[PDB]
Write a protein that binds this ligand. Structure first.
Ligand SMILES: Nc1ncnc2c1ncn2[C@@H]1O[C@H](COP(=O)(O)OP(=O)(O)O)[C@@H](O)[C@H]1O
Ligand SMILES: Nc1ncnc2c1ncn2[C@@H]1O[C@H](COP(=O)(O)OP(=O)(O)O)[C@@H](O)[C@H]1O
Ligand SMILES: Nc1ncnc2c1ncn2[C@@H]1O[C@H](COP(=O)(O)OP(=O)(O)O)[C@@H](O)[C@H]1O
Ligand SMILES: Nc1ncnc2c1ncn2[C@@H]1O[C@H](COP(=O)(O)OP(=O)(O)O)[C@@H](O)[C@H]1O
Ligand SMILES: [Ca+2]
Ligand SMILES: [Ca+2]
Ligand SMILES: [Ca+2]
Ligand SMILES: [Ca+2]
Lengths: 287, 287, 287, 287
């Protein structure tokens, strides 16, 4: 059955690079893309930035389905087509299927799940084809809803706590005054403090060298009335982003009703908010 | 009445640059272009070169008319669309009109007549969007058929002659041996020799300074049995290309049945052949 | 006296665009630039990203001064040269002058002061020539030290206060729970709360329409124990960035020893930190 | 001994692509290139075209040697440098060596010999970095003088002949009137006619199928008083360019004093002239 592959990925996820190599290897396959249509009807150049308009979007949408119809109603030579957009809008994604059935075509999805940190990394160098962070963020947030990834939301029963980070947040990567005050203000308030850190626990030869150093400084110098502490396991090289988000679902979320996140590294503040935890960023953390 | 503007011009003639500025100033106008569609269905990048295929052309054509229909069947907001191709194919150009009438739309043409010399000038710097000389040549040859420009073809009654050029052809810009021999070989053969030159005749103060110098060298040193001589009028700054093509229709074509053209400057050899005169190029003449 | 113009501006501030147009109009002027040299010795392409190395920087530096010497020791035709870098390093900037005097040349500065908001705007679209935010930030922070712009640092005598923002911070652009709690936690703690907002005060016909609405919501619904409130004057169209930074130096800084800034709009959080006030960003604010 | 590699190749021959990959693999190696320097001192953009000027060339030259000195006088870490230009000027090439010895450095050459047909192929798509055919031609002509390739010039004793081509020249790829006349005009004149062709002689099963067809048409229909005929051997897939230039040095040049070449395919007309044989091109032959 002639197929309609939808690529599912955020801007600069590989979608297009894939559809070109693929079509270049699989005869009978043709591409359909919104950005292309968007740029074409405006006669724009590479350095020109298109301006969103319902009227134009309507036209573009119009152009896709029609082209789908046209090409897919070709010979037996035509094996199918690729709708190389972000396709992160469920409302529309559904629309393509219900369109596909009423014509005898099947629908496939080719997913391009690239890590946020890597999506930013790429989108910033994307130049004129780059996209604003809120859209990139908004997009990724849909890529997660698609994948069915978890989003937190309190935990009835467990105490109301506030997770804190050390490097840069609690400490000035000596004590970072205002923030350390906060940890205690929240201490009075009736909150559980759960300090956390992405500093590797230690070295292969001594797997807690740094964890102990941290815990000591946190308690003895800063004097943070922590209730629990968690750190990056020794010999773990995954992203801070990935790392803490695991520590959450595995230790804190279950024994705690989280209300806040005090941190400083963007990728981490990005992760916190993204999953459902409010996060206040106390300093610039672009690294 | 909603309009369908067709741009008539050769590659790199201004077409697109026009349609962008225009649409950018005239609301209700949208663009339709083949190259765009061609690149899109292949998912190509700027550095990739598409490969002509009837099957794809058919698809592209399909995409244009359908998009025309779609957009033009919009509100009263839609004033019309631009078909920004070369549109130098009469067969198709007709097709758009006969399509336009059977839907209640008019058709307009925006012509971009740029000089050949300038088209090459641009196309060579066009980079990856550049096009092979024979297509550029073939294209321009259609742009002329469109404009209704003249193409020569003998002249019954008048003698059979061969036009010769001086700078570079007859002379080594001292005598250029083989070529000068030819002028006489054709002299025996029973041909009229009509020497011609784009060397300005002279200076404002002496409007034949060079014409005389030339004629003298041509007769006295080279010894070319010329029957007639023509040169660029003093104070004329138009192109060699333009220049000689006027001298032809005004002096030679009427009193002669031309069979050959011996020359050396590409733009001129290009012009000769282009209008209907066979031309042998005796040396590299890229200047 | 032959001159050595140094361009003073952050990445994507106009520097290069200026030096090209200038040299294009002023004969006897030649360009010297680090990025160029950096890319050249590595044989890099546009899509390649150079890697910082002292050894290479040393070489590049070496290349500039030598080229300066070489060209400036030309004829009377050579009027001078442009050192089109960021030149925001005082250590080096000094070096060029002390170099200039020991050879009989003067030094000029052409400054390109572009607003941060506009620098980000451009750098994000800069593509492969774009630069990381911390460097852009770090750079701008030097452009300010150059211009001699003010950086705050407490105010002895005046009470310790915390400035708060409304739209997005205190309010969910109904009340934003955690943040409003904070305003009171700091209220107990012994801090003065100085709410602030970039919401235009009102309309030409009623220049406080919104200021009153705000103040009411802030006091009556949120219940923030504010001590003072400031807002964007009616009919003011300058940037939020520019706006609040004026309200600070003119109303708060003088009557207050500021310790914190709770806000949400990046350009504003960027401004706060930049001038010397710690700022915690409570939510994504990329708009 | 620290080395100075000079790349020897025509525009778009691989030079730069090589020097980047190389430096990327061999630590201690740095690049020096004229075009870079040329563009930098003018502050030019990619779409801007530099304008040749002795004064600027002098400056650029100045910049290279100085940079050579500078970098090569680095530590033991510096293994050498690449002068990635065309380096087809012997006058200068010598200069680099005599410069190298007076400082204790050796000189190496990395040659990039790419076929003319392929150089044009590339240079036309080179876009703004492309170069005019006469320079490309002039360049290749130096690349040949470097390689020590042969250039013809008469052959005392042997008769004065004129080589003719069939496809497109003698025949209209039926007879091509004017050109066939010429073959006989030269026949009277006292010249030997040596017809030649790049049409494969035949098929594996019958290695002269086409050679016979040709010879028959040439003699029986056209009536060319040929004295000798040569064709592309069966099962030969090298370029027409390469092909005929071998047939020349192996059959004609030795038994003939060539005065002219009548042909039509550019790559071949290009080859003829290039080696020392005058060639008149009778028609457009861009294929
Ligand atoms: C950049 O952006 C373009 C698209 O890149 P890619 O990330 O692979 O696809 P997509 O953005 O559609 O997911 C390429 O030309 C690349 O060089
Ligand atoms: C080159 O080629 C593109 C099209 O140029 P132009 O000659 O104006 O239009 P067209 O080739 O359609 O006639 C532009 O981006 C320009 O910079
Ligand atoms: C982008 O970046 C390049 C340099 O831009 P510009 O901001 O004007 O100069 P600079 O970054 O040196 O201050 C240009 O080619 C422009 O199109
Ligand atoms: C084009 O021209 C540039 C130089 O190409 P190349 O032919 O490999 O080197 P060179 O022209 O120096 O011999 C590249 O960026 C390529 O994409
Ligand atoms: Ca941190
Ligand atoms: Ca001439
Ligand atoms: Ca706000
Ligand atoms: Ca031929």
């Amino acid at each position: 059955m002639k197929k309609i592959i939808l690529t599912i990925g955020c801007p600069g996820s590989g979608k297009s690079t894939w559809a070109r190599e693929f079509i270049a290897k699989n005869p009978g396959f043709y591409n359909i893309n919104r950005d292309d249509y968007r740029q074409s009807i405006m006669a724009h150049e590479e350095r020109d930035e298109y301006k969103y308009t319902k009227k134009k979007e309507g036209i573009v949408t119009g152009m896709q389905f029609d082209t789908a119809k046209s090409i897919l109603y070709g010979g037996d030579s035509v094996k199918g087509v690729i709708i190389s957009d972000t396709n992160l809008n469920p409302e529309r994604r559904l629309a393509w299927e219900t369109f596909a059935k009423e014509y005898g075509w099947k629908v496939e999805h080719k997913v391009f799940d690239v890590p946020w940190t890597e999506l930013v990394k790429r989108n910033s160098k994307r130049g004129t084809k780059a996209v604003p962070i809120d859209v990139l963020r908004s997009m990724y947030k849909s890529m997660r809803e698609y994948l069915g990834l978890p989003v937190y939301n309190g935990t009835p029963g467990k105490p109301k706590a506030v997770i804190f980070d050390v490097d840069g947040t609690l400490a000035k990567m000596v004590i970072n005054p205002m923030v350390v005050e906060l940890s205690k203000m929240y201490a009075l308030m009736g909150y559980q403090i759960v300090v956390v850190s992405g500093r590797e626990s230690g070295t292969k030869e001594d797997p807690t060298k740094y964890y102990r150093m941290t815990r000591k400084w946190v308690e003895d110098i800063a004097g943070v009335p922590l209730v629990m502490q968690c750190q990056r396991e020794q010999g773990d090289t995954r992203k801070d982003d990935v790392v803490k988000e695991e520590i959450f679902w595995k230790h804190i979320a279950p024994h705690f009703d989280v209300k806040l996140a005090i941190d400083d590294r963007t990728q981490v503040v990005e992760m916190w908010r993204r999953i459902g935890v409010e996060c206040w960023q106390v300093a610039s953390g672009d690294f």
